[PDB]
Paper text:
To determine the [name]-NTD structure, we successfully crystallized the fusion protein of [name]-[name]-NTD as well as its Se–Met derivative and used single-wavelength anomalous diffraction method for phasing. The native structure was refined to a resolution of 2.35 Å. One [name]-[name]-NTD monomer constitutes the asymmetric unit of this crystal. The long N-terminal arm of [name], the regions of 98 to 103 and 291 to 304 in [name]-NTD, and the four C-terminal residues were not included in the refined model. The part of [name]-NTD folds into two domains. The first domain (N1; 1–290) contains a seven-strand mixed-type β-sheet flanked by a four-strand antiparallel β-sheet on one side and a two-strand β-ribbon on the other side, plus 10 α-helices. The second domain (N2; 305–492) contains a three-turn left-handed β-helix, which is terminated by a two-strand β-ribbon and followed by a cap subdomain of a flanking β-strand and five α-helices. On the N-terminal side of the β-helix, some features of the electron density map suggested the presence of a bound ligand, which was modeled as a Hepes. The Hepes on the N-terminal side of the β-helix in the [name]-[name]-NTD crystal was loosely bound. Except for the sulfonate part, it had few interactions with the protein, suggesting a possibility of nonspecific binding.
Residue numbers in the entry: -78 to 97, 104 to 290, 305 to 492
The structure:
Amino acid sequence: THINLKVSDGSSEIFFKIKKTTPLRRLMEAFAKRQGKEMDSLRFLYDGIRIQADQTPEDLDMEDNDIIEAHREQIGGEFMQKLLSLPSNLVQSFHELERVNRTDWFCTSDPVGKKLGSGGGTSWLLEECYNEYSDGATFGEWLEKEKRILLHAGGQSRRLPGYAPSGKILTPVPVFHLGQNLLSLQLPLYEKIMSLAPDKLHTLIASGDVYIRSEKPLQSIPEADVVCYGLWVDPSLATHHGVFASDRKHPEQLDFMLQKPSLAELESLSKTHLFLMDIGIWLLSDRAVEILMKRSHKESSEELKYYDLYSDFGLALGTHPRIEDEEVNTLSVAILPLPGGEFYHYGTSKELISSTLSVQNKVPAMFVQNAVVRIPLCAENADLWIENSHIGPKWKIASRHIITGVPENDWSLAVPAGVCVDVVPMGDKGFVARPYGLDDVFKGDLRDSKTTLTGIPFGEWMSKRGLSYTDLKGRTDDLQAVSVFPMVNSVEELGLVLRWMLSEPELEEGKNIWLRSEHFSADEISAGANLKRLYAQREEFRKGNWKALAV
């Protein structure tokens, strides 16, 4: 008495006739043989549990026309090196802070001076890695050796001040795994991809501020020189991103690239092309890497040049490139839709909150991590993110807040809706107070009424406190470089000055403190932050949160 069984890899289903008392070893071996691989490289699941190979259908009570799911399995084995472009202050400390070893993890920062872009940055990352792990080989020989995952996270993070000095990707994210952050949440996708990739694509490039997800298995990975992942997009969303346009009859090859097309330009091609949103996951062959790298160097001298991977290099790809490049155009290109692909941005504060809510609600918009909260919390306090902070019982809060870094205190601090509070350790014992607003973009000349601090015009913020531009040493063209935030040496002064910078501008001692305190811009904060004290405080809050009998 026999039974028919489907096995699905994610795309197709294939039927096996087998006797109910025959071990599945034969079936799994045959399915592995069919898909070129071998049974060791596959994971067969039925009902959700991983099954052995010496088990018979009668053992696990399966019936005719049932389906078993065959996922790939590249968990252990040859591990890829991670190359990070990070803020320079975090480079010195990343390995100690996250306790990873330098064999698996290399990082650097853009050199002090001019910026290099996505392409130039990638070239500098590959170069700085080779210069430390070459072991005598040449560059082309070194690149062949390992698969490597490169992450761009070295920008200024103007719109996410709470985690700019730690590069955004080191942000703790809750759950409702062990302890985890954005990077640890995202990296398994990159690792799975890079395992499934051919052994000629040795460099994955990830950039942007978008967390990518998918609950379905990946498709096979072509053997082009450039592979790019994307999501099928209607123009209503294509217009906001980089777009791969492909011919109607050729949904695999890349026709050309677009950087944020207009709604009309897309309607002008709606009959002749399909559109994929670039999600910032690329794979390059060694030849692609060499060509990108030489395009990231000058003509005569071979050193450094701003080169944009997506607007310079990228726009030169496809069968109908828009910008000319002799060598770049010769590279083949594959555009892969991400099966079950999902994307959630985290470049801005509002996005941190809403994206973590959306991601959590897949495997209520209030999030408390590594914190002591001494006030009650109800559904009126919606859109909340408290992390590495002590919220004393005399605080008054509302909704839409990001509170990060706040040391232990009994402050009577009121926090208006939409206002956020960040504290950043500085020096051996100081604290920089960085209040701001949920929609501050931290860009703009100070004399423009659209340039805001804590959601009100900067000039107004200055005049409510009796301050003039005479009290600001330095530039005023760009709020991100304006030294407004004071460094103080006590939690008392810290609370006094924070109150003064929010709802109590009449607090005289607050203004006195600010006037006698060193002033930091956001750039100087993320350039000088004492990350070790920030992590130490976070861990002390964790340890306190593990005291089971404490209320």
